[PDB]
Every structure is written in C-alpha cells, then in structure tokens.
Amino acid sequence: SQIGLFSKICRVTIKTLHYYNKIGLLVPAYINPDNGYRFYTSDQLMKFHQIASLRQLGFTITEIVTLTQDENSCHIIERRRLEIQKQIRDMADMLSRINHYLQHKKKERIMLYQAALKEIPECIVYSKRFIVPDFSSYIKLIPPIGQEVMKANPGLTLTTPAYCFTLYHDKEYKEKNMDVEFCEAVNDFGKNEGNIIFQVIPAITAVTVIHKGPYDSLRNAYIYLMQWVEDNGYLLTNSPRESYIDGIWNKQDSAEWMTEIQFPVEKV
Amino acid sequence: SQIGLFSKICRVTIKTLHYYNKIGLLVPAYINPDNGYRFYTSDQLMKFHQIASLRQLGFTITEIVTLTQDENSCHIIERRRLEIQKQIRDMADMLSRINHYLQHKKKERIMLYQAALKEIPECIVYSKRFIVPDFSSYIKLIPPIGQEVMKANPGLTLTTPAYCFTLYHDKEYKEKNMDVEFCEAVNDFGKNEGNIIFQVIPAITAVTVIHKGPYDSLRNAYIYLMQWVEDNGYLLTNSPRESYIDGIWNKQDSAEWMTEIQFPVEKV
DNA sequence: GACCCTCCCCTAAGGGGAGGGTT
DNA sequence: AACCCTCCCCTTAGGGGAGGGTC
Ligand code: 118
Ligand code: 118
C-alpha cells in the first residue's frame, strides 16, 4: 500500500508519515530502492493506532519513541500525569484570572491596575520598624534614617537594582498609628546601629501592581490587590510590601511617581 | 537604565527584551545610534508589567500587541476565555485517560489494547440487517451478500480504503439472537432489491481498539472498550461497529488477522 | 491524471552561541 | 573582563510549496 492509501486508512497527512519515517517512529515495511516509494502494511496500521493513542494523551514525539520501544518504561507516564495535573491547576488559575479581568473591565471602562505574579528573591536589607502618625510624616522621616545608616556604615553599598521598600505589619486598615517597617536592600550584612537593624527578608512569590501617581491614592491599588487576592482564591501570606521605584528623589513631577505594591501571596 | 540593569529590574532575560524590541512589543526609550545600546525608562517598566500581566493569562504575543495598542478589545479576552475552557476540558480528558492507562499498565505488564479517539466520516453502504443464530455462523453468510450485491448492481465499486464493518444493534448482551447488520462502504448508490438496502451511516466520533488475532477473543476488546467508556466518562451514543481490516480473505494465519472495534461515543 | 520523492522555508517565544565593539 | 550589539541556527509536530520523477 502506497503512502496515499495508508494515509487514507489512518486518516492522517502524508507529511505526518514522512516526518515519522524521518524520526524513526513508524518506519515503513518496504522502501522501494529505485524511486524511494514508501509501502505500508497493516502491521504498520496497528503501530500507528498506538502512536495516535499516545499522541492523544499529550505525549511528545520523543516520549513516544521511548514508550513504544522501551516497553517497560512506566515513569514516563506518571511524569506526564503530574505534568497534566500541573497544567490543569494552572489553567483553572488562568480562567479565574480572566474572569476577574472581564468583571473589572465590565465594571470600569479602563484597566487602571493590572495584577501580575512575580518572584521576589531574598535580600539583605537594613530595617527600621517603628510607629508613624500618618504616611506623610513617614515620608519625611525616611531620608534622615537612611543618612544615619549610610554615614555610620563605611563600605555599605546599596544593591543594583535598588530594591527599597516598606512593610505594613498591621492586620486591619489603620489610617493612623501605622506599624510600618522601612527597609532598603544592601549587598551584605552591616553592623546594627541603635534602633535600625539588619535582617534578611525572605524570598516570596507575590502579586504585584505598579501605581503611577501621587502617594495619597495608593488606597486604590491596595483595594484592587485585596479584591484580586480574595477573588482569585489566593491567600495573603505576609505583610504587604510597597516598593518605591520612582519618586521625589528621581523626578520632580508628582504625576510620574512610580511605586509598586507587592502582596506576598500563596494559593489555597 | 541600560539593558542589563533593566533585565534585572524586570527579572527577565536579555534575549526577551531583544525579541520584544524586534517585534515592537516593548521598544526602548532611547537607542544609542552608533553602538546600538538600548536604554530603558520607568515608563518601559510600567509597560513590561502590562506585558507580563497579560502573558500570565496565556495571551499570545500578537494578542498582547493588539490588547496594549488597541483599546476596547474585550472580544479577544472572551476568545481567550473560551479557549481556556476548551483546553481545561481537553486537559481533564487527558488526565482521565492517563489515569486509566496507568490503572491498566501498572496492573498488567503488556498492553493488549490501546484506545484512540478518532472521527469516522460519513459513508454510503449496502447493508443487510438480519438475526444471526451464532457469531460462528455469521462469518459464513457474508460472501453470499458480497456476490449478490455485485451481481445485482453491476459496476458498483467499493470505496478505497475498504470500510467493511458490522453494526451490533443489540443494546444488551446475547450469544444466539444477535440483531446485527453487515455494512460495507461503497462509492455510489444502487438498487435495494431484497433485504439488502442502501443507506448512509452518519459520521461518528468513536473510541477504537485494534484487535489482532482470531475472532473468538473479540469479547475482550469489547469489554475493554466498555470499561474505557465507563472510566473516562463517555457515553455510548450508537451501536458499536466492528471493522475487518484483515481476515481469511488476505491471510491464512489466524493470528495475523486484524480488526478494529469502534464505539460511537460523545463526551457527556 | 494521479501520485510520490527530496529539499527548502515556516511556525511561537525566545535560547544559545559566534564574532565584533567599547571602555 | 564586563556589558553591549547583530547574525545565524535551534527548539514542536508537521504544513506548504517547488522542482523533478514515477505508475
Ligand atoms: C536611604 C534611605 C532612603 C532613601 Sb530614598 C530612594 C533612593 C533610591 C531608590 C529608592 C529610594 C531618597 C529621598 C530623597 C532624596 C534622595 C533619596 C526614599 C524616599 C521616599 C520613600 C522611600 C525611599 C535613600 C537612601
Ligand atoms: C463484498 C462483501 C464482503 C466482502 Sb470480504 C471477502 C473478500 C474476499 C474473499 C472472502 C471474503 C468479508 C468481510 C467480513 C466477513 C466475511 C467476508 C472483505 C472485507 C474487508 C476488506 C476486504 C475484503 C467482499 C465483498
């Protein structure tokens, strides 16, 4: 049976049989040495049946050329099973995220904020945890606190990129008397000085929202990220970080201040 | 911010930034004309965050270009949601099939029947539906039909490849009172003289196993296909077909015979 | 007329490397 | 040596077509 008749038997393309014969899977029974014509037999039809049965299970071709010659191999099936379970767990997540995106675009005409998961590696920061009356005074109190460290610690150098951020160790919404902790990543351990300490901030997976604008409207970003966490079946693991990428130190216009909200989060 | 600093800010590879600059997804704020060095800006990070937020939902790159360049594109998000649900159905199907495959392979070292889900197109057949006293006697009455149809309808040409099957119209198991119908795909219509009639058989999606060996062991393949149907949550929609690939007409060896059992099913 | 072969380029989203540049 | 660039080839499972030959 020539390649066309066999390709009509299996309901498959001739190019598929060519590719298979090239890769070594499903080699034909008789190759005409004069013109190269590939002739097939029903013994090849029964082989293509199991080839298609494995292909319908998601196995890649190099997995099939192992499954069909190394007959005892069973770990390559449990591996694909765990892979399928991971794919389902990711696809359901993506479906919930798309549903949330659609709900938000229906409610508001514009996707002002856009959540995105990212992996934040651990870093050595110098930290000062204290109580502030409000956010405005906290912004004023940060730079002298940084100056104290960079003066009293020779050889201390900031990290590139400059990961400078704050943590909010409250559990409920506190407009005032906020137990904020300011941190700034350093290349290595420095010595403690007074109330300012050093520590390692653990590596986290976090959903992130960048907020372009003034600081007095970060409540919108926090409300959006909390809605995202509650909706998509996630759980806030740790205190929410807030990363200062751009601000009064780098730009003079308040409308171009760029800050990134980070929610350390884990899935339930 | 140079490309090396930006790749660490974004926590992505450099070649990703090169690809996004080449396709036009993320273009640097300023490219040095002589060297070619790409330089980035906070407003490029604000856009890479959008790129990542959309790519974590599984959007293709061109869909991301269409989404960030053209607003009011909620039809593309709906398309992606429908495709996500389709992929979730297919992944759950794959998971159930590989669970069944593991349940059988870790039970018995050899796989006797692989199961493949293939779509059979519609065809024109001549058929004789009659009660057969036994399956052993069933094979005997077929060549009479085969001669009679070619004698009554001259020039009637069978299709290629030959689709010759049996329709087991019994909704319950029995040995001696089998209500079966022998069908054979033919190119064009003919006369319906006698109990042999012409008809079309609707196109079906069917799970199929290929049975190699004599016709007494077919109950094994039928029980296996029923077990597959019950395990994988399919529903048997129509009467099972039995496609005779190889038989007494091509090969004298009874262990070289081949036959394909087809179960018309739908996913419910 | 139909059918079949090899050879070449293409997919999506980058990965890896070679060779050249500059401070 | 540290970064940077462009250019070329590579990944899947085959698709599409050109040019040439065969039944
Ligand atoms: C030590 C402590 C704080 C700051 Sb900064 C800053 C600088 C670079 C990158 C990120 C943050 C600052 C403020 C004024 C002038 C110069 C630098 C800072 C400001 C507000 C909130 C958080 C951090 C700097 C050093
Ligand atoms: C018309 C009807 C049936 C068959 Sb045959 C067959 C052919 C030659 C010699 C003996 C038998 C068949 C099928 C099932 C049971 C008994 C006979 C047949 C079927 C498929 C492919 C090729 C031949 C052929 C023409």
Numbering used by the authors:
A (entry chain H), B (entry chain G): 2 to 269
Quote from the publication.
An EcmrR dimer binds to promoter DNA between the –35 and –10 elements and introduces a 58° kink in the DNA backbone, facilitated by A:T base unpairing at the center of the pseudo-palindromic sequence recognized by the EcmrR dimer. In addition, EcmrR under-twists the 19-bp spacer DNA by 82° relative to an ideal B-form 19-bp DNA and realigns the –35 and –10 elements for recognition by σ4 and σ2 domains, respectively. The spacer DNA conformation in EcmrR-RPo is highly similar to those observed in the structures of BmrR-TAC and CueR-TAC, reflecting a shared DNA remodeling mechanism by MerR family regulators. EcmrR-promoter binding is mediated by both base-specific hydrogen bonds and backbone interactions. The characteristic HTH motif and a following β-hairpin straddle the DNA backbone. K16 from α2 and Y38 from the β1–β2 loop insert into the major and minor grooves, respectively, and make base-specific hydrogen bonds. Backbone phosphate interactions are mainly contributed by H19, Y21, R39, R56 and several mainchain nitrogen atoms. Intriguingly, we observed strong extra density in another hydrophobic pocket (hereinafter designated site II) in the cryo-EM maps of EcmrR-RPo and EcmrR-RPitc-4nt. The density likely corresponds to the tetracyclic sterol head of CHAPSO, which is routinely used in cryo-EM sample preparation of bacterial RNAP complexes to alleviate preferred orientation problems.
Bacterial RNA polymerase (RNAP) holoenzyme initiates transcription by recognizing the conserved –35 and –10 promoter elements that are optimally separated by a 17-bp spacer. The MerR family of transcriptional regulators activate suboptimal 19–20 bp spacer promoters in response to myriad cellular signals, ranging from heavy metals to drug-like compounds. Here we report one crystal structure of a multidrug-sensing MerR family regulator EcmrR and nine cryo-electron microscopy structures that capture the EcmrR-dependent transcription process from promoter opening to initial transcription to RNA elongation. These structures reveal that EcmrR is a dual ligand-binding factor that reshapes the suboptimal 19-bp spacer DNA to enable optimal promoter recognition, sustains promoter remodeling to stabilize initial transcribing complexes, and finally dissociates from the promoter to reverse DNA remodeling and facilitate the transition to elongation.
